[PDB]
Amino acid sequence: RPLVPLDGGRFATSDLNDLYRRVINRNNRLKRLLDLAAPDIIVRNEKRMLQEAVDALLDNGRRGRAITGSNKRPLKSLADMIKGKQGRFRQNLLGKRVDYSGRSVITVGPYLRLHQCGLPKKMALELFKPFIYGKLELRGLATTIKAAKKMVEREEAVVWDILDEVIREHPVLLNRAPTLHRLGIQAFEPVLIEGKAIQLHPLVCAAYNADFDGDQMAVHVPLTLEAQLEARALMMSTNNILSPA
Amino acid sequence: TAGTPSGNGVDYQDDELPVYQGETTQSLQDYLMWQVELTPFTDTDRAIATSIVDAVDDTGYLTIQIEDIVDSIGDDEIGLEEVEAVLKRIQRFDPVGVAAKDLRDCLLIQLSQFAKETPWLEEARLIISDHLDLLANHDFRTLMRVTRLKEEVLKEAVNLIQSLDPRPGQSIQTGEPEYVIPDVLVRKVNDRWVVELNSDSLPRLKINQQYAAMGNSARNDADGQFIRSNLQEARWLIKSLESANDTLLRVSRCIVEQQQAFFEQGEEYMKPMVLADIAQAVEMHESTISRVTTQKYLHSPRGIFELKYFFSSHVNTEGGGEASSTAIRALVKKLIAAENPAKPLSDSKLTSMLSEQGIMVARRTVAKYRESLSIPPSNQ
Amino acid sequence: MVYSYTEKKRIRKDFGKRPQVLDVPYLLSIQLDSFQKFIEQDPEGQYGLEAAFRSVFPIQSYSGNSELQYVSYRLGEPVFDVQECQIRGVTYSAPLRVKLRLVIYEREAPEGTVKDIKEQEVYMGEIPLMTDNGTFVINGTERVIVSQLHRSPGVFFDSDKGKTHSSGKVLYNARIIPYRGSWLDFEFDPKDNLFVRIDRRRKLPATIILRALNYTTEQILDLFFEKVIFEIRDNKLQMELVPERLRGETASFDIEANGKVYVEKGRRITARHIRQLEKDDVKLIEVPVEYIAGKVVAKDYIDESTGELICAANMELSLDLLAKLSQSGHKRIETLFTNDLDHGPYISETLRVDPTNDRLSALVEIYRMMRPGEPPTREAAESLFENLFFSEDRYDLSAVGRMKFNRSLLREEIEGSGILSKDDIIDVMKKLIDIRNGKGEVDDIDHLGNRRIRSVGEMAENQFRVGLVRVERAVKERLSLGDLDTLMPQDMINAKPISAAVKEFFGSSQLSQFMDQNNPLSEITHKRRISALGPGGLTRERAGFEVRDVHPTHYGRVCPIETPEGPNIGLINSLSVYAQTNEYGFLETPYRKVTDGVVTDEIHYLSAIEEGNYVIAQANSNLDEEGHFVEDLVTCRSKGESSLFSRDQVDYMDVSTQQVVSVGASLIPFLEHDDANRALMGANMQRQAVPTLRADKPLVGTGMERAVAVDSGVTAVAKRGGVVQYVDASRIVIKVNEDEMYPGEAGIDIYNLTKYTRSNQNTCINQMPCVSLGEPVERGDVLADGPSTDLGELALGQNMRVAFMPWNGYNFEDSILVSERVVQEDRFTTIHIQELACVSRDTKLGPEEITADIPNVGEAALSKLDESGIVYIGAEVTGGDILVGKVTPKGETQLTPEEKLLRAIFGEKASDVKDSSLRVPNGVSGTVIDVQVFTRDGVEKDKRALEIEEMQLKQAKKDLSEELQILEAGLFSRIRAVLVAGGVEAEKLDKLPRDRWLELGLTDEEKQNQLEQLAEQYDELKHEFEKKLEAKRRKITQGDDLAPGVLKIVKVYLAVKRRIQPGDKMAGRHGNKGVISKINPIEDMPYDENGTPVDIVLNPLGVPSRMNIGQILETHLGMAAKGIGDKINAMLKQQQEVAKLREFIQRAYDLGADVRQKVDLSTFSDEEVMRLAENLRKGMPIATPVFDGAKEAEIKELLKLGDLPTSGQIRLYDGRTGEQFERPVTVGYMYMLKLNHLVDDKMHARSTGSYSLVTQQPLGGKAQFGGQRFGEMEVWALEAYGAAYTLQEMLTVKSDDVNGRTKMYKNIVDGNHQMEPGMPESFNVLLKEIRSLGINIELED
DNA sequence: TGTGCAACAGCATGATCGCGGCAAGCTGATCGTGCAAAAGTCGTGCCAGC
RNA sequence: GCCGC
Ligand SMILES: [Mg+2]
């Protein structure tokens, strides 16, 4: 529940911390006033206000109106954090942003085989950077990881030769954004091309519900012996020819 | 405003329940531990590497001793012989020369990784770095005789030495926080130098507190009336903010009226303003005013940005009445700066000159002022 | 005369066929009219801040014998123009000055004064001003303000569709909307009882609000129901006859008229029996006593004997009660109608619901119900009721609201009070009651006669008022504590609230946003845009299907084509090309009056109701020479429908077919051959086109390109054009004709053409001259064209030679196959300009300095830096090159011996100062174009800055000295003429300067009058010019008042060229979009018999399933146009004599089937014919209006005149094999656009970067190096495949496993490929969040 | 024949309402107090190095 | 606000 920083050195308290501060302030004031033998009316008012503050902290907007912040929108409470589409269950878990991922516009490749796809060579060398580092250090071109990183940053020709071997036998996954069915993402053997657009086989367009008027796809790399095999044995385009409907 | 800077880049987490979340950043130790993970090390070697990487400063130097590293491990067969080997392995990382014991170590490690055919590598590998470093710090006129070499070759040997990186490991460091100042108290120049308080936002907080708390209370959807739940909380918030603003404004006003001499004409016209001097002016305790003036900053056309600077309680037993050392310090800086190429500036001579000017200051008092931000120009 | 100078250069061949009654409007007048009615003052309080000032002022403190009298206001002169404001990043505004007087009234003398201080005007706030194009430069941006379409204040009746209770019961409600204040509701429950919902509170019956107006139930009964008199005298108990009301009833007994039987008992009721009874004049007749049993007494009859009486109104009568009333002497008994045939039981039931019968009781009831807090004390309720409605300040219907209110209730008067009276609520309730009874009908809420428009002026006025009211509040208090010495500026001027509210509205508002600057047309569409959202509007989810539908009243007001697609469909609209707004604020469209059988050229503007009332003919109905319809039966619109009517029946005629098409849609040729939903796509995609290196006119147009190009303000238009004197790539100077001039000082026209500059979308806006030298120029001519404009015509794409065929799968789906000749010729190449800024601010360590020297940086990075430390103008920068060198100081006061050693060997700073410099971001390649150093007042001026100052002042004097030179030349000519009149030395006089010592004195009159006056004028002119130049110079060099922290700002501009590439998206203007699939070498493209290859290959399969027939017609017409241009080019190559070239041009221009455009080269200059021929050498620019354009036969005869096949299909050969294709392939010319979607701006790949602190998951989006989101459906697909290990590697490591990420990276570098998965941090965050509640959640073992 | 019980209609409240991507767009903190208690610092005088 | 559905 970290507070948000501001220009200079100022810090702004998040809506979670505001509820805690309100609860603590009310509790402290009630505790101090209870030792002073105050009249029962003020004590009852303080107890009710503390109960309301706790209720607002646990679930804002329940039993009354919702406490709002500087702007006229309710403060996010503990319950506003575990429920709904923006909650952890639907946002952070069951769905997650992942590394080794790419994206660009798709074009058509009619020279392509069914199991092949055209991958821009600029996307690769980034999606496969650890593999390139490993091959560079294995072949004696780079002794330290720093040397391999510097060599990749300069993009010498031997780095392109190493990249081609990395892409020699490693399947890749392409996915289109509204994945109604598992045909939404399919496995392919990447073919390195000069350009900035992914080349897609025309026979899988219907299954993807894709056309070449501005659609984009995402790219994912299965960096595991098990994941590579699963992509080759279960998710390749040449595997799923009949619709499972 | 004649010209306005473009808005700085900002971000906030959208479509996420814990709003603004955060962002990870890479530091020197984070980038060094990344390299440790990707080099072939044993378990004990990895432990030693983590131990000595934790001790690397922001400059990338090794603040703790090697013997202290050996002590920290407290493990048999982990003597300094292997700690040194792991240390050299770590020193040969991407910021070459990082995690070095001292300045000589940085230069020696940096010079090790070269073509070995550099025109003056061996001339400056050990002769200048590993020996007579203090001579290179000085003019090194006698160093030519010491190393049995002409001054001409040394003229570029020291050039290579300077070409070597002074403090490696602060290059990878980012530095996003500029630590800019909003200058809560802008003051301007008028016929009497009026002062003002900006960034109060008290009316802004008042309006928002109204529209939220008093807005909910006035909204008659809820039964009864919420005249005490939040209506008498917004009032307390406004009162607290206004009280703080008034106290700050009054204190800054007293400081400005007392130190108007600083802003007018030359800067070094500070009176030795003690906390009690403003405490009596505002008829309030010094401690409350002190806490107030600890980190509050004022915007000056020429003056420094800092309330605490004006206090300078430095009566210094000056000839006529009293004076301030900060003004005396500026005077000493100006006098020492404008001298002959020899520039004696002897602490006795400087004190005598100051006393002749009318500042009865001890001979050693001037020395501490000079050593605060300068070095004696061959006064020894 | 017939054609203007700019239009004689290249004349479009219009295909016309219908004369135009009126021309097209500016299209940006709306914004201009609104803001002019806002800032401009008015002698009345009708318009201008004047109305708000009169609404608030005068203000007086309570019992303060003090007043604030307001007199006039004035707007100051802006300190910067639009250009300097836009380059400096400030707001273009003006200072507001208002004069007011303070008068002190005498306390001792009633209504008397003792003091009156009328000090000068006071300053509050700054009013942003709109430019000549209708935009607001605030903080150096463009920020158009969009108009809003909301519900007009007034009264509205609805029925909630009659499906609420599932019983088939239709529930009718009435509603009152004011401009500001609380709302009022009247509803019907399924039990048919009046309910009042005040301010959306709980339902309350109408009797309490009825009684709160001092209405007694008896009085209410008479008003609510018509009463009937029952007379019981001498036991006869006669009944008054009302035959009109007695329509449907059953005769319980025999009815006799004057002792004669009229209607028998149970006799069938017939309109005939009622008429017979009415014909016979009959007095009161007796009735059965039992019948009165069901009647309800209306009044409260009093007993003359005792005070006891039957006051129980809304109650029936008993048999024993009859004896009581007979004994009391009640001869006549008043009862209400009690009839249910058309009328019904209302009000009385609501009276039975609630027993409160006193004004105080009703007031306390409403106070308790609306405010559930403390009970009132006869004063809180009394005050609250006044606050709710009919309060001068709290509640106000606008003049529009009052007009609508009176119109809905059928009142003759239009004007009235802004607050509702007692009679208004009575009339609303009566109308609502009558609506259920059968009379009247429910109104449409989506009818355009119920929807009003608010523009920028009215919203600005509303915001100004809130600032006024806010400031007025604070003003009232200090009058109580204000002494006579107090002055208006000291009377709580409070400039803060007014300026705060104004800047809040103008800067951060829903309807305030950046103007789209991709094209001039896109800016025009944004300027003429109508939104249903906003503060007073409706939210997106709160909208429904019927709100977003096309209404029949949308005909000539909003185009039914242009609208966004996904979420905002039907909620954002555009004005039709001819539409205009009413003074009240209702949309209007023009029609031509029809008198007898002939239409007249007089034009009337009719709102939705006005158009519905009359029979309006169609635009495409044929007419005669005298104006009479050729065909008797004509098609018209009568009332939301269409059918055949006689010509005399028509009362109005549509002015133009385009009347129903938006300006953006007006630009689609052959629109009527395109699907409306598909056309929507073409109109939307037309505004995303980016201007290319060179503008190219459309070969096929509609004739609206000139209006859009000129009215957008993108070009330079001669305001008072005379003759062009000097031309340059940056300046145009025009010598104004002497036929019109301003006396004194003469004058010339200076135009500073805009060079390359950034737009809001990072494109380039540039202007190039169209005139050469010594060219005559008329008023309104185009001198220089801006981005995507060609000789004053909108030119937003390029003309491509296209074949419609499949080519080996490279145009599969919507793919586009492009030749290499397109790339080589730099067509579809754009310039993109970016802005980077660096600011230096003082820090706790110290000031932040900008210097060329940088610690720990090699000489290579400083190669391109200036002495100050800035990249040289014209430098080419890539990657992470350094633009501005900046160093921030570090904090250190303890000098360690090593630190002293470091300072000894290295520089004094020893690199203590950190490096915070402006470097080019990765992926950004740019060339230094413009540096804009700004310096604080007092600090040392930057070394580069003086150069900018020198360029500024040099340009200032260069463009300032021209008028001085002309004026001094005129003075010299006058002096020479005077000396010629007497003592002329001719060349001897001309050789000696100063007029040869003013030619001595010569005659006494010349010396005393001529020479003396000439010398005086010379000296005065020289002094004035020197003063003006000095003032300009002093203005140029001035300290920049910056933010208190800010010390220096440096701005750097980069320019790049975008090469066309396959991943790029292209489109035509018929909804046909696609991305490039391949760039083909020139020898591979299909070619015709002459060896000319095509540029583009398009798939034929995209046409028939899209119904894009305008594609094919445009292609055929472009082929014809290029054929005519080819013939002209061939004639020009062989240098044929002008006569036959003129003959061929004439033959081509007058082709068609009775087209209106008449052009004859006979009145054309011989040289002008040559110039026109060279201008249309590439092709003839045809123009086909939207719904009245070219036909197939006309296209075919144009093809014949061009010597081309009539079918539009030619023989093509394969470029790779040389074989002829079997079928003929269509080849022609089509206008193709390049849209703002690029692979470079849409290519991203990440391996590993930064992660969110919460959930330990990678960030999202490019420009942040994020990862692609693996959503829920992706995980469902992986589960369906059965790929468990792929899913585990996506869900755990490589996402949120902090240790798993590093372990996997190390394994991959080692070539192991083993996941070793752990537990995600998001689940730990969830466990902590749940435990932070009262719930204990744990992991068992 | 008047009475008590169980089934039902009307109303109020709660919960839910697709998926990816790109822009432009931005929040503050308060006492205070006097008081000794404690820590800290400044002007001044020491002895050791040149 | 826009793009792909
Ligand atoms: Mg598509």
Short mmCIF file of N, CA and C in Angstrom, two decimals, chain C residues 91-154:
data_model
loop_
_atom_site.label_atom_id
_atom_site.label_comp_id
_atom_site.label_asym_id
_atom_site.label_seq_id
_atom_site.Cartn_x
_atom_site.Cartn_y
_atom_site.Cartn_z
N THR C 91 -0.78 30.42 -22.73
CA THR C 91 -2.17 30.53 -23.14
C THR C 91 -2.40 31.86 -23.85
N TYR C 92 -3.13 31.82 -24.96
CA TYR C 92 -3.48 33.01 -25.72
C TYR C 92 -4.76 33.59 -25.12
N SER C 93 -4.62 34.67 -24.37
CA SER C 93 -5.74 35.25 -23.62
C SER C 93 -5.62 36.76 -23.63
N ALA C 94 -6.61 37.42 -23.03
CA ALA C 94 -6.66 38.87 -22.94
C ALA C 94 -7.03 39.30 -21.52
N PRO C 95 -6.50 40.43 -21.05
CA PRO C 95 -6.85 40.89 -19.70
C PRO C 95 -8.22 41.54 -19.67
N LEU C 96 -8.98 41.20 -18.63
CA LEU C 96 -10.34 41.69 -18.45
C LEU C 96 -10.33 42.84 -17.45
N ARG C 97 -10.78 44.01 -17.89
CA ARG C 97 -10.86 45.20 -17.05
C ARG C 97 -12.31 45.64 -16.97
N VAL C 98 -12.79 45.90 -15.75
CA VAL C 98 -14.17 46.31 -15.52
C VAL C 98 -14.17 47.53 -14.62
N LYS C 99 -14.96 48.54 -14.98
CA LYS C 99 -15.07 49.76 -14.13
C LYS C 99 -16.29 49.61 -13.21
N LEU C 100 -16.09 49.81 -11.90
CA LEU C 100 -17.21 49.73 -10.93
C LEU C 100 -17.07 50.86 -9.90
N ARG C 101 -18.17 51.26 -9.26
CA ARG C 101 -18.13 52.39 -8.30
C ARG C 101 -18.65 51.92 -6.94
N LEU C 102 -18.08 52.44 -5.85
CA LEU C 102 -18.56 52.09 -4.49
C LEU C 102 -19.29 53.30 -3.89
N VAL C 103 -20.55 53.11 -3.47
CA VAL C 103 -21.36 54.23 -2.91
C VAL C 103 -21.76 53.89 -1.48
N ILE C 104 -21.57 54.83 -0.55
CA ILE C 104 -21.92 54.59 0.88
C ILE C 104 -23.25 55.30 1.18
N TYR C 105 -24.26 54.54 1.63
CA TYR C 105 -25.56 55.13 1.93
C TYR C 105 -25.60 55.63 3.37
N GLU C 106 -26.34 56.72 3.58
CA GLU C 106 -26.44 57.33 4.90
C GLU C 106 -27.23 56.44 5.85
N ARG C 107 -26.68 56.22 7.04
CA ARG C 107 -27.41 55.47 8.06
C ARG C 107 -28.52 56.31 8.67
N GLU C 108 -28.25 57.59 8.94
CA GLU C 108 -29.25 58.44 9.57
C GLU C 108 -30.38 58.79 8.60
N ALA C 109 -30.03 59.12 7.35
CA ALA C 109 -31.03 59.51 6.36
C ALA C 109 -31.43 58.29 5.55
N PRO C 110 -32.69 57.85 5.62
CA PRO C 110 -33.11 56.70 4.80
C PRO C 110 -33.01 57.02 3.32
N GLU C 111 -32.58 56.03 2.54
CA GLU C 111 -32.45 56.13 1.09
C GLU C 111 -31.55 57.29 0.66
N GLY C 112 -30.54 57.62 1.47
CA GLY C 112 -29.61 58.68 1.15
C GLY C 112 -28.18 58.19 1.22
N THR C 113 -27.30 58.86 0.49
CA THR C 113 -25.89 58.48 0.40
C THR C 113 -25.00 59.61 0.91
N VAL C 114 -23.78 59.24 1.30
CA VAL C 114 -22.83 60.20 1.84
C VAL C 114 -21.53 60.19 1.04
N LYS C 115 -21.23 59.07 0.38
CA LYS C 115 -19.97 58.91 -0.33
C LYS C 115 -20.18 58.08 -1.59
N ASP C 116 -19.34 58.33 -2.60
CA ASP C 116 -19.43 57.63 -3.88
C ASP C 116 -18.04 57.68 -4.52
N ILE C 117 -17.33 56.55 -4.45
CA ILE C 117 -15.96 56.48 -4.94
C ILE C 117 -15.94 55.75 -6.28
N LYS C 118 -15.76 56.50 -7.36
CA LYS C 118 -15.68 55.93 -8.71
C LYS C 118 -14.23 55.86 -9.19
N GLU C 119 -13.44 55.00 -8.54
CA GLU C 119 -12.07 54.79 -8.99
C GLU C 119 -12.07 53.98 -10.29
N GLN C 120 -10.92 53.98 -10.97
CA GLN C 120 -10.78 53.37 -12.28
C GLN C 120 -11.03 51.87 -12.26
N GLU C 121 -10.94 51.24 -13.43
CA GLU C 121 -11.29 49.83 -13.57
C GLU C 121 -10.35 48.95 -12.76
N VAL C 122 -10.81 47.73 -12.48
CA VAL C 122 -10.06 46.74 -11.71
C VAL C 122 -9.84 45.52 -12.59
N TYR C 123 -8.79 44.77 -12.31
CA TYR C 123 -8.43 43.63 -13.14
C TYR C 123 -8.76 42.32 -12.43
N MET C 124 -9.52 41.45 -13.10
CA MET C 124 -9.71 40.09 -12.59
C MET C 124 -9.64 39.12 -13.76
N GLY C 125 -8.90 38.03 -13.56
CA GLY C 125 -8.88 36.94 -14.51
C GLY C 125 -8.31 37.27 -15.87
N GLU C 126 -8.12 36.25 -16.70
CA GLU C 126 -7.75 36.41 -18.10
C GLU C 126 -8.67 35.54 -18.93
N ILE C 127 -9.28 36.13 -19.95
CA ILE C 127 -10.25 35.44 -20.80
C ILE C 127 -9.50 34.88 -22.01
N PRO C 128 -9.42 33.57 -22.18
CA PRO C 128 -8.82 33.02 -23.40
C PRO C 128 -9.62 33.42 -24.62
N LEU C 129 -8.91 33.76 -25.69
CA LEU C 129 -9.52 34.18 -26.94
C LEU C 129 -9.34 33.10 -27.99
N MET C 130 -10.36 32.91 -28.82
CA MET C 130 -10.28 31.96 -29.92
C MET C 130 -9.66 32.62 -31.14
N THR C 131 -8.92 31.83 -31.91
CA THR C 131 -8.23 32.34 -33.08
C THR C 131 -9.21 32.53 -34.23
N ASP C 132 -8.69 32.98 -35.37
CA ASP C 132 -9.53 33.20 -36.54
C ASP C 132 -10.08 31.90 -37.11
N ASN C 133 -9.53 30.75 -36.71
CA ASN C 133 -10.00 29.46 -37.17
C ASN C 133 -10.93 28.76 -36.19
N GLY C 134 -11.14 29.32 -35.01
CA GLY C 134 -12.02 28.70 -34.03
C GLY C 134 -11.34 27.73 -33.10
N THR C 135 -10.15 28.08 -32.62
CA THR C 135 -9.39 27.24 -31.72
C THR C 135 -8.85 28.08 -30.57
N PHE C 136 -8.58 27.42 -29.44
CA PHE C 136 -8.13 28.08 -28.22
C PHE C 136 -6.72 27.59 -27.89
N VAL C 137 -5.73 28.45 -28.11
CA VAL C 137 -4.35 28.12 -27.75
C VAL C 137 -4.21 28.30 -26.24
N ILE C 138 -4.31 27.21 -25.49
CA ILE C 138 -4.10 27.24 -24.04
C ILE C 138 -2.93 26.33 -23.72
N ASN C 139 -1.96 26.86 -22.98
CA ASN C 139 -0.70 26.16 -22.71
C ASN C 139 -0.01 25.71 -24.00
N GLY C 140 -0.12 26.54 -25.03
CA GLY C 140 0.52 26.26 -26.31
C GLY C 140 -0.01 25.05 -27.04
N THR C 141 -1.33 24.85 -27.03
CA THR C 141 -1.95 23.74 -27.75
C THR C 141 -3.07 24.29 -28.62
N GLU C 142 -3.91 23.44 -29.19
CA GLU C 142 -4.98 23.90 -30.07
C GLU C 142 -6.36 23.86 -29.42
N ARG C 143 -6.77 22.70 -28.90
CA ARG C 143 -7.87 22.61 -27.93
C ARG C 143 -9.16 23.23 -28.47
N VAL C 144 -9.74 22.56 -29.47
CA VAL C 144 -11.09 22.92 -29.89
C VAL C 144 -12.10 22.50 -28.82
N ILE C 145 -13.18 23.26 -28.71
CA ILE C 145 -14.24 22.99 -27.74
C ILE C 145 -15.49 22.56 -28.50
N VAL C 146 -15.96 21.35 -28.22
CA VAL C 146 -17.00 20.70 -29.00
C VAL C 146 -18.37 21.11 -28.47
N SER C 147 -19.30 21.36 -29.39
CA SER C 147 -20.67 21.71 -29.03
C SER C 147 -21.40 20.50 -28.45
N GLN C 148 -22.43 20.78 -27.67
CA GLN C 148 -23.17 19.74 -26.97
C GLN C 148 -24.65 19.76 -27.36
N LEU C 149 -25.22 18.57 -27.50
CA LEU C 149 -26.63 18.39 -27.84
C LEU C 149 -27.33 17.79 -26.62
N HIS C 150 -28.16 18.59 -25.96
CA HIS C 150 -28.81 18.19 -24.72
C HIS C 150 -30.31 18.44 -24.85
N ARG C 151 -31.06 18.07 -23.81
CA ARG C 151 -32.50 18.28 -23.78
C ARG C 151 -32.80 19.72 -23.39
N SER C 152 -33.69 20.35 -24.14
CA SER C 152 -34.06 21.72 -23.84
C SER C 152 -34.87 21.77 -22.55
N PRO C 153 -34.68 22.80 -21.72
CA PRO C 153 -35.55 22.96 -20.55
C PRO C 153 -36.99 23.17 -20.97
N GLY C 154 -37.91 22.67 -20.15
CA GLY C 154 -39.33 22.77 -20.44
C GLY C 154 -40.08 21.65 -19.74
#
